[PDB]
Curated annotation (Swiss-Prot):
Keywords: Acetylation, Activator, DNA-binding, Nucleus, Repeat, Transcription, Transcription regulation. Belongs to the TBP family. InterPro entries: TBP (IPR000814), TBP_CS (IPR030491), TBP_dom_sf (IPR012295), TBP_eukaryotic (IPR033710). General transcription factor that functions at the core of the DNA-binding multiprotein factor TFIID. Binding of TFIID to the TATA box is the initial transcriptional step of the pre-initiation complex (PIC), playing a role in the activation of eukaryotic genes transcribed by RNA polymerase II. PROSITE patterns: TFIID. This is TATA-box-binding protein 1. Belongs to the TFIID complex together with the TBP-associated factors (TAFs). Binds DNA as monomer. Interacts with TAF1 (via N-terminus). Interacts with MEE12/CCG1. Associates with PWP2 in the nucleus. Component of a nuclear protein complex containing at least TATA binding proteins (TBPs, e.g. TBP1 and TBP2) and ATX1.
Length: 186
DNA sequence: GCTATAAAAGGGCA
DNA sequence: TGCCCTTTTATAGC
C-alpha cells in the first residue's frame, strides 16, 4: 500500500503497553491468594503480576485499582486483554469498572534489508543520534517530529518506540527511510 | 542472562 | 521531591 507507505515497508507492531482504571481500591493479598494466574511480592514490586494466554499479555494490578497491561501485539488486543483482567478482578468480588483505557506505548520493528553505515549516520545527525557501539550495538535516534525513538542496527533492522498512535510509528519510519538509504553501507 | 529504548503504574528511600 | 524498581518487546553485542 504505497499511498500510505511510500517506502513500501510497514513496521510490524511488537508490543503494546496500555493502562486502565478499574475504579475501585483492590486487595492485592486477597487477589494473589485467590487468583491462580497471579504473582505478588510486595517487597519486590507493589503490584500483583497476572497473565493470560490470549491475547498473551502480562498485567500489573495495583492496590489503587489502576492497571498496566503489557505484551499485546495490537491496540485492540491490548484493550481486549485489559478487559479480560477487569472481569477476573470483578469475579474475585471487586466492583471493577473500566475507566480511562489508554494506549501508552506501541513498539514496532521492520527490516530495510540493506546494511547501514551507523557512524556516518551518527556524524551527520549528531543532534539526534547517540551511538556508542562498544556499549550497545544500535544507534539511538531520537526523532523530534514525531517525538519517536528509533534503534538502528547495521543489519538494516530497526526498532521504533514511544508511539501513542500507530501512525506516529509509521511516520517516524517513513521519515527515517531516506536517511537510512543515504547511509547505506556498500 | 545481560548493555539500550519507550511507556505506565506506586512504594521506598536518600 | 524524584529515581529505581517491575513488566513487555523488537534489535545485537558481550
Amino acid at each position: 500500500d504505497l499511498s500510505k507507505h511510500p517506502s513500501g515497508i510497514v513496521p510490524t507492531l511488537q508490543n503494546i503497553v496500555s493502562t486502565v482504571n478499574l475504579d475501585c481500591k483492590l486487595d492485592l493479598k486477597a487477589i494473589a491468594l485467590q487468583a491462580r494466574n497471579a504473582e505478588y511480592n510486595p517487597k519486590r514490586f507493589a503490584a500483583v503480576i497476572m497473565r493470560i494466554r490470549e491475547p498473551k499479555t502480562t498485567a500489573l494490578i495495583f492496590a489503587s485499582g489502576k492497571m498496566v497491561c503489557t505484551g499485546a501485539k495490537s491496540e485492540d488486543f491490548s484493550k481486549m486483554a485489559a478487559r479480560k483482567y477487569a472481569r477476573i478482578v470483578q469475579k474475585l468480588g471487586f466492583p471493577a469498572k473500566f475507566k480511562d483505557f489508554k494506549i501508552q506505548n506501541i513498539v514496532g520493528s521492520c527490516d530495510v534489508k540493506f546494511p547501514i553505515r551507523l557512524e556516518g549516520l551518527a556524524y551527520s545527525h549528531a543532534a539526534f543520534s547517540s551511538y556508542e557501539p562498544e556499549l550497545f550495538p544500535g544507534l539511538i535516534y531520537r526523532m523530534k517530529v514525531p517525538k519517536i525513538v528509533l534503534l538502528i542496527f547495521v543489519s538494516g533492522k530497526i526498532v521504533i518506540t514511544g508511539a501513542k498512535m500507530r501512525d506516529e510509528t509509521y511516520k517516524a519510519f517513513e521519515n527515517i527511510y531516506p536517511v537510512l538509504s543515504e547511509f547505506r553501507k556498500i
